[PDB]
Amino acid sequence: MVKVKFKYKGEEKEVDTSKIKKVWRVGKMVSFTYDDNGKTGRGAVSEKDAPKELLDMLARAEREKK
């Protein structure tokens, strides 16, 4: 259940790791770039509604930084 659920293209969006390009903290918010069939795209979530796998990828990043 643990591809990344979020919002993009004016709908809900689910992305697999095969497509994820970057994840970091935009200060307050979890910010990523993910891919769609060769073009990039930006995804984001707030912690309160960020399920575990999204966290896990961001987590190594965030812990390392902090």
From Swiss-Prot:
PTM note: Lys-5 was 70% monomethylated in form 7a, 25% in form 7b, and 20% in form 7d. Lys-7 was 50% monomethylated in form 7a, 40% in form 7b, and 50% in form 7d.
InterPro entries assigned: Chromo-like_dom_sf, DNA-bd_7a-e_arc
Influence of pH: Highly stable from pH 0 to pH 12.
Ranges in coiled-coil conformation: none
GO cellular component: cytoplasm
Gene Ontology molecular function: DNA binding; RNA endonuclease activity
Pfam family for this entry, one: 7kD_DNA_binding
Domain of life: Archaea
Annotated protein name in UniProt: DNA-binding protein 7d
